[PDB]
Design a protein around this nucleic acid. Structure first.
Ligand code: ZN
Length: 252
DNA sequence: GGTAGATCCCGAC
DNA sequence: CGGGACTAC
């Protein structure tokens, strides 16, 4: 799930778990648990705590309990469901939080790339994976000025810059490619090569693109198909180690 | 310190 | 082969 999907999850999941008390935590793939390193300590500390809130930072979910926060990332294919402890689990279920009311919060992930970290609430923001996370793309904290400052100080491509979690929180591949197209900027452009005008335009499109989604693709996954604006075949290459889609006419 | 690289998984190729 | 977010040049 990308940022907008994670926000939907945050909004929809909260009422399904708020006020419920954890009675057990069951772990079927320990590698998902990143802190405490010992999955048994992770499970033990959560028992007896009640879910009080659910927040989002980038693509991370932050479950707020009594004492602790659970920081969860779903990566490409992770998903949460709330269901009865009486029913068989769905395939690829790796972590289950059992509540005293007989319901469960279940984490599924066919790829097993997801991560979970638990810390005392007051420590979560200064520990991995939240430490160093950049500003929310939809917050005034993410400004053209902030973007420009990062762009000038690097030799990397503009795409690499936007994918950097320290630059902006949870701005995914699909939105990077779409935003760059809408801004008329080639993904392989050196970040430092962007004019003040281009930085302003890029910020504008980043906010518009992801903002619209949080509330029709031009290039992403459209290689070999005509550009919706000019008819030129969309091309796909590798930039910043990722599949990258662009129109060679609209973007410069 | 900045930057790339190794790293995890497994279904679709 | 792809992909989000600790180690070594
Ligand atoms: Zn075009």
């Amino acid at each position: 799930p990308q940022l907008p999907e994670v926000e939907t999850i945050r909004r929809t999941l909260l009422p399904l778990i708020v006020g419920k008390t954890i009675e057990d935590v069951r772990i079927f793939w320990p590698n998902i648990i990143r802190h405490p390193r010992d999955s048994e300590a992770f499970a033990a500390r959560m028992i007896g705590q009640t879910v009080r809130g659910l927040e989002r930072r980038g693509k991370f979910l932050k479950f707020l309990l009594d004492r602790d926060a659970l920081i969860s990332h779903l990566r490409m294919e992770g998903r949460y469901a709330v269901a009865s402890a009486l029913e068989p689990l769905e395939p690829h279920t790796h972590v289950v939080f059992c509540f005293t009311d007989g319901s469960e919060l279940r984490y599924r992930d066919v790829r097993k790339f997801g991560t979970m970290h638990v810390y005392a609430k007051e420590e979560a923001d200064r520990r991995p994976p939240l430490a160093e996370l950049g500003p929310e793309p939809l917050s005034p904290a993410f400004s053209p000025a902030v973007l420009a400052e990062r762009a000038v100080k690097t030799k990397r491509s503009v795409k690499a810059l936007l994918l950097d979690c320290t630059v902006v929180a949870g701005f995914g591949n699909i939105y990077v490619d779409e935003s760059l197209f809408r801004a008329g900027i080639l993904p392989g452009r050196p970040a430092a090569s962007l004019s003040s005008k281009e930085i302003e335009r890029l910020h504008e499109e980043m906010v518009a693109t992801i903002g619209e989604a949080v509330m029709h693709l031009y290039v992403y996954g459209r290689q070999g198909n005509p550009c919706k604006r000019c008819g030129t075949p969309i091309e796909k290459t590798v930039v910043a180690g990722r599949g990258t889609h662009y129109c060679p006419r609209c973007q410069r």
